[PDB]
Amino acid sequence: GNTTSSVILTNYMDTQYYGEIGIGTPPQTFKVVFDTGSSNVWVPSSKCSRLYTACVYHKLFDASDSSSYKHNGTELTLRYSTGTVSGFLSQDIITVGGITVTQMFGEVTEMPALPFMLAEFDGVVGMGFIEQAIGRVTPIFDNIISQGVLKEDVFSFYYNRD
Amino acid sequence: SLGGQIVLGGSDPQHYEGNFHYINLIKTGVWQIQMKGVSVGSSTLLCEDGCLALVDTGASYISGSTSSIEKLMEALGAKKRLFDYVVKCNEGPTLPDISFHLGGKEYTLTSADYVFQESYSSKKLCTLAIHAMDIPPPTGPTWALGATFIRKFYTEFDRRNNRIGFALARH
Ligand SMILES: COCCc1ccc(Cl)c(CN(C(=O)[C@H]2CNCC[C@]2(O)c2ccc(OCCOc3c(Cl)cc(C)cc3Cl)nc2)C2CC2)c1
Ligand SMILES: *[C@@H]1O[C@H](CO)[C@@H](O)[C@H](O)[C@H]1NC(C)=O
Known part of the structure; x- marks a missing residue:
């Protein structure tokens, strides 16, 4: 390839930079930050x-609307400073741009209101x-590399100013 | 108005200039490189004996240790608040350049790059795009170069070569 x-x-106020992914069949779309620190x-x-205020205003993955969903259920935790x-x-299947990959991901059932709301x-x-x-789950770009469809095993970031 | 862009598989020349300069990662495992000093003006205030720099796209701000940023902030005349540092808005534009020594180069931000110039009034306080965060082992203590840095410096994360590459962003 x-x-x-x-x-x-999207640049929100020079403080949050996020774009679109799809998860499932048919795709449920989410705004996500692409985070080289995690x-x-x-x-x-x-x-x-x-x-949970942090959940009450964002989009939630519903496994039972997705025909490509495959259940796992292993509990996993992140220690954030605020809780x-x-x-x-x-x-499930995740699409980032023109790319589709089967990917293990975490569904969150509780988080602190701050800063996440x-x-x-x-x-x-x-x-x-x-x-x-966390839990040594294969990260998405590892799975993209294993598809062997990329020109180079690199990814680049541009961040505009408001 | 485009808010930004990620490229999987390459880079976009339309959004940077010149050529990438690269820095080896210290270890595979973490998107972290060696830093050789933080300047305020043309003088090296900090990181004089080497220190670490995480290149963190999911962070809003440039961060140092609490001890480092207390010092950085001293030098800027900036005031400590519960969550942030501020200067009086009228001095934002005169604040000195801050430089990050990375690989062969100085990576220089001006005040336009790190002051939220929401006003120019001496009666009003402006936030700085730099915070104290203490990152614990393994990764930390480290600086983190977040969106404050990435806005100025288009960035390539290279897995094949375990390097990171910086180009001046074309806005
Ligand atoms: C640079 O653009 C955004 C900067 C920015 C602005 C606000 C917040 Cl809260 C963050 C947080 N934000 C960060 O600090 C990240 C910055 N780098 C290291 C990890 C990090 O601290 C982190 C912090 C939290 C986290 O939690 C996982 C839960 O993810 C969710 C998030 Cl994060 C938000 C919502 C609504 C739902 C879920 Cl399930 N994962 C990674 C991660 C990377 C998002 C970053
Ligand atoms: C969830 O997936 C991981 C894969 O590493 C596996 O180790 C774990 O046992 C799984 N749990 C299941 C299938 O219930």
């Missing part, structure tokens, strides 16, 4: 209680290394 795939991003994919779960982020492993995006695609991955 000689493919390069781009993804237009290695996992997380979105809100349709199982996250509406009594714990947690949910469970799921596998102020996020203008719904989730996160970690672009770091398997070493930094």
Whole structure:
């Protein structure tokens, strides 16, 4: 493959930069930050209680609307300074730009209201290394490399100014 | 108005200039490189004996240790608040250049690059795009070069070669 795939991003106030991914069949679309300081994919779960402010205003993955969903359910946790982020492993198809990959990702069922309620995006695609991955889950760009369809094993960021 | 862009598989020349300069990662495992000094003006205030720099796209700001940023902030006349540092808005534009020594080069931000110039009034305080965050082992203590840095410097994360590459962003 000689493919390069781009993804237009949104600049919110010079503080949040996020773009679009799709998860499932048919695709459920999420705003995500592409985070080279982390290695996992997380979105809100349709199982996250509406009594979490951080969940109550973002888009939630609903596994039971997805025909390519494959259940896992391993609990996994992130220690954020303001409180714990947690949910469970799921596998489904994710599209980033022109690229489709089967990917293990975490569905979040509880998180701190701060800072997450102020996020203008719904989730996160970690672009770091398997070493930094929680539960040593294969990161998305590792799975993109294994498809062997990219021109070069690199990814680049442009961030505009407001 | 385009807010930004990620390229999987390559880079976009339409959004940077000149050529990439690259820096080896210290170890595969983390998107972190060696830093050789942080300047304020033409003088090296900090990181004089080498220190680490995480290249963090999912961070809004440039961050150092609490101890480092207290010093950086001293030098800028900036005031400590619960969450941020501020200067009086009228001095934003005169604030000195801040430089990051990375690989062969100085990576220089001006005040336009790190002051939120929301006003020019001496009666009003402006935020700085630089914060204290203490990152614990393994990764930290480290600086982190977030969106404040990435806005100025178009960035390539290269897995084949375990390097990172910087080009001046074309806006
Ligand atoms: C640079 O653009 C955005 C800067 C920015 C602005 C606000 C917030 Cl809260 C962050 C947080 N934000 C960060 O600090 C990241 C910055 N680098 C290292 C990890 C990091 O600290 C991190 C922090 C939290 C996190 O949590 C996983 C849960 O993900 C969700 C998020 Cl993050 C938001 C929502 C609504 C739902 C879910 Cl499931 N994952 C990674 C991660 C990378 C998003 C970054
Ligand atoms: C979830 O997937 C991981 C793959 O690493 C596996 O180790 C774990 O046992 C799985 N749990 C299941 C299939 O219930």
